[PDB]
Design a protein around this ligand. Structure first.
Ligand SMILES: CCCCCCCC/C=C\CCCCCCCC(=O)O[C@@H](COC(=O)CCCCCCCCCCCCCCC)COP(=O)([O-])OCC[N+](C)(C)C
Ligand SMILES: CCCCCCCCCCCCCCCCCCCC(=O)O[C@H](COC(=O)CCCCCCCCCCCCCC)COP(=O)(O)OCCN
Ligand SMILES: CCCCCCCC/C=C\CCCCCCCC(=O)OC[C@H](CO)OC(=O)CCCCCCCCCCCCCCC
Ligand SMILES: CC(C)CCC[C@@H](C)[C@H]1CC[C@H]2[C@@H]3CC=C4C[C@@H](OC(=O)CCC(=O)O)CC[C@]4(C)[C@H]3CC[C@]12C
Ligand SMILES: [Ca+2]
Ligand SMILES: [Zn+2]
Lengths: 671, 40
């Protein structure tokens, strides 16, 4: 048998005292008042005493919203401490007003009434608390190293982190940003960015800072949603302290704000500037118009170069026409690169007619990249992540040009390629040119963003490449390990190239040999084993060492089982799990990326596609009025949605029970 | 410290006026009718 007792004993209540608390619970005003006036005389019943479940009489009256017993206890001067916070968390405006008019606690000591109101996100109570001059202390920097922060971290790191988290949850309140903020949209933007940075820094408290940042982004989105006219939309988007607030939203990565339908509609009607009725057109006439503009890019470009002030000169300044001209010029560049592959023994030859055409687009690409560098700056250049491969293309083109010039100057004769040197400058130049050709032709992935049916697909690829990168570390570790083992076994039986039937050594021969003789060749062989191009007899030696053969063969088999059966199917399962997490937000992310691509063409800089590129208090007052109407509409909408969602608990049933019982004792008293 | 105020100020109600709206909220017909005939 197990004895049961109370190992942590407390102070029990007496019979009359339990009767008093029970009368408070059922709401008998006559009995409670009689007990109070009897206690004032006899000092027999403690009015500030506790209950078995953690509450006192004022707490019971507050949770049961019985304002009349609550004010009776206030008039009899019961203990008051933390009951204000209890009324704040209870969301009872009458209790809040009465306690403003005048041990164990389930609240942290930092909990201030404004902060608990900001947690409860109740606009009424937050505004009544803000009516009095009440202050929230400022959080320090994200990476602050001052003496106060290091002392608070050293003394009690749990209370420091809880205090910072408590401050930021107070500040991220949608009601507390709707009031007491000169610019709620910009405040929500900066607060969301800061909460994202604190989510990145504080690893353990990551999810709560993530959800606070998401709450701020949702608040900004709904505030934009409450607009009701195109002027108000453009006042919001064009406020600066054009499209300044939109550029700020793009800078702070507010994809929910950017992907608003009204903002996307305004961006679309700015994008289709020259064509007012592109929204309602057929597929065939859209394709015909696109090809018609795309076949006239040199005419429009030379029109801009000659006279910007004409029906054709400023026609390329429209964003869609500029995008079509850039795409058409780049596609003609790729067509010429395809034509370039269509005497070959000259050492360091002069450039042909096709390369003589290619050279100005190469110069224009380099000039455009360095012009974007010099104009935008550094962080904006490195943030794009396409400029890395753009730099790779420019570097490979420059290397090809330099090697071609070096070969043309240094060599003159016509020697056949069969006896050329292996590190010949012409060979190096042509290899670099082919690599740059591939990089140029995969640069077209960036144009899938502007299409409706390919943009989310590109977003899904960009989100699953991260998991491919995660898997590549494990696969390369396994590859290095098995390459090391197979080298350590097989590098005694290395054979010269002369002993081979056709003077070829390596896995690229007709008869594959020496697949595990050197570390480079072992890495190549175990890489090509994934696609099945490495035959089985590469695990063979001329000598009769059958045990050596069997250990090498089972090493190869273990590598194949780990890679193709385990790791590849692991990669399939990982990307399949990752795709479902992206399919929900793919539309929003695609709309954000397409907005960035659209705003990339709104500038006057970079207008000419290559190779042609080498040849004020009223605004504040109107914005304040629009935001004031927006805040009123948003508070009304979130009050309506609070009165439309579920919202109901057993609090409501015990509230109705309390009202019925208080009335019951009232009419039993009056009758 | 961050000061808190009402940056978009509105028109507050008086004491009797808040009492009238509170009586409307609790549904006291006698008090609401008395307040109406007194306001007239
Ligand atoms: C992102 C990363 C950066 C990407 C861009 C890098 C641009 C780099 C540009 C520099 C190009 C230099 C070419 C060689 C000239 C010097 C020379 O004589 O070479 C010697 C050595 O040659 C080598 O070692 C060959 C190097 C080929 C590099 C190919 C990189 C492909 C990246 C693909 C990426 C996908 C010749 O041999 P020897 O001395 O006679 O003996
Ligand atoms: C001697 C060796 C010779 C080898 C010869 C052959 C070489 C072949 C090399 C092939 C490389 C192919 C790389 C293709 C990448 C495609 C990426 C598709 C997804 C995508 O759009 O990714 C973007 C990231 O940029 C990127 O993914 C940029 C990738 C840059 C790669 C640069 C390689 C050099 C994300 O989009 P976003 O960046 O707009 O997202 C918002 C801002 N973060
Ligand atoms: C991820 C990284 C960690 C991976 C952990 C391990 C995963 C499981 C590895 C299993 C390796 C089995 C190797 C078998 C072997 O030696 O074969 C080569 C050699 C080739 O001679 O096989 C033999 O000599 C034995 C012949 C019978 C083998 C039966 C194998 C049954 C299971 C096959 C794999 C599943 C399909
Ligand atoms: C892949 C196969 C079919 C070989 C053809 C290669 C290229 C000639 C293709 C592949 C990708 C294509 C691009 C994919 C998407 C677009 C966006 C498209 O614009 C829209 O979606 C129209 C609506 C709008 O822009 O608002 C204009 C054509 C373009 C650049 C395409 C032009 C032709 C490209 C470069
Ligand atoms: Ca670029
Ligand atoms: Zn500090």
């Amino acid at each position: 048998r197990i004895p049961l007792q109370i190992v942590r004993a407390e102070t029990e209540l007496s019979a009359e005292e339990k009767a008093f608390l029970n009368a408070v619970e059922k709401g008998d005003y006559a009995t409670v008042k009689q007990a109070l006036q009897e206690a004032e005389i006899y000092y027999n019943v403690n009015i500030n005493c506790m209950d078995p479940l953690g509450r006192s009489a004022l707490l019971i009256a507050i949770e049961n919203e019985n304002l009349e017993i609550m004010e009776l206890l206030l008039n009899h001067s019961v203990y008051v401490g933390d009951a204000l916070l209890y009324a704040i968390r209870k969301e009872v405006v009458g209790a809040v007003e009465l306690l403003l008019s005048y041990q164990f606690s389930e609240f942290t000591p930092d909990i201030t009434p404004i902060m608990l109101a900001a947690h409860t996100n109740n606009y009424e109570i937050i505004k009544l608390l803000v009516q009095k001059r009440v202050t929230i202390p400022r959080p320090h920097q994200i990476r602050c190293n001052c003496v106060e922060c290091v002392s608070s971290s050293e003394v009690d790191s749990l209370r420091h982190s809880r205090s910072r988290l408590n401050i930021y949850k107070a500040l991220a309140s949608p009601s507390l940003i709707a009031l007491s903020s000169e610019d709620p949209i910009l405040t929500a933007f900066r607060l969301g960015w800061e909460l994202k940075e604190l989510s990145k820094v504080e690893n353990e408290f990551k999810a709560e800072y993530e959800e606070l940042s998401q709450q701020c982004k949702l608040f900004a989105k709904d505030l934009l949603d409450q607009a009701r006219s195109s002027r108000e939309l453009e006042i919001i988007l064009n406020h600066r302290d054009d499209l300044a607030k939109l550029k700020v939203a793009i800078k702070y990565h507010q994809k929910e704000f950017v992907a608003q339908p009204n903002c996307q509609q305004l961006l679309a009607t700015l994008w289709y500037d020259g064509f007012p009725g592109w929204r309602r057109k057929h597929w065939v006439v859209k394709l015909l118009t696109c090809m018609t503009i795309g076949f006239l890019f040199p005419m429009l470009s030379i029109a801009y170069l000659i006279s910007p002030r004409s029906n054709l000169g400023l026609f390329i300044k429209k964003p869609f026409i500029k995008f079509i001209c850039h795409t058409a010029s780049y596609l003609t560049f790729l067509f010429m690169l395809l034509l370039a592959s269509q005497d070959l023994h000259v050492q360091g030859p002069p450039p042909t007619v096709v390369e003589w055409m290619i050279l100005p687009w190469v110069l224009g690409f380099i000039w455009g990249e360095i012009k974007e560098m010099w104009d935008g700056g550094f962080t904006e250049y490195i943030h794009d992540w396409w400029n890395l491969m753009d730099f790779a293309m420019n570097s490979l083109y420059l290397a090809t040009i330099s090697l071609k010039i070096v070969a043309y100057v240094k060599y003159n004769g016509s020697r056949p390629r069969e006896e050329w040197e292996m590190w010949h400058p012409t060979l190096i130049a042509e290899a670099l040119f082919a690599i740059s050709n591939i990089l140029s032709s995969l640069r077209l992935i960036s144009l899938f963003t502007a299409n409706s049916h390919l943009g989310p697909l590109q977003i899904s690829l960009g989100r699953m490449l991260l998991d491919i990168l995660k898997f590549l570390f494990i696969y390369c570790l396994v590859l290095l390990a098995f390459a090391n083992g197979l080298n350590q076994l097989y590098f005694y039986y290395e054979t010269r190239a002369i002993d081979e039937p056709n003077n070829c050594k390596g896995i690229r021969c007709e008869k594959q040999n020496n697949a595990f003789s050197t570390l480079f060749e072992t890495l190549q062989s175990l890489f090509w084993s994934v696609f099945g191009l490495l035959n089985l007899y590469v695990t063979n030696v001329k000598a009769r060492h059958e045990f050596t053969e069997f250990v090498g063969a089972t090493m190869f088999g273990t590598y194949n089982v780990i890679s193709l059966v385990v790791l590849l199917n692991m990669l399939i399962a990982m990307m399949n799990n990752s795709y479902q997490l992206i399919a929900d937000h793919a539309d929003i992310e695609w709309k954000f990326a397409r907005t960035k691509l659209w705003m990339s063409y709104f500038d006057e800089g970079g207008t000419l596609p290559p190779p042609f590129n080498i040849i004020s208090l009223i605004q504040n007052q109107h914005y304040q009025e629009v935001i004031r109407n927006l805040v009123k509409r948003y508070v009304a909408a979130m009050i309506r949605n609070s009165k439309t969602h579920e919202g109901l608990t057993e609090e409501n049933f015990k509230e109705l029970k309390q009202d019925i019982s208080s009335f019951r004792y009232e009419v039993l008293d009056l009758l």
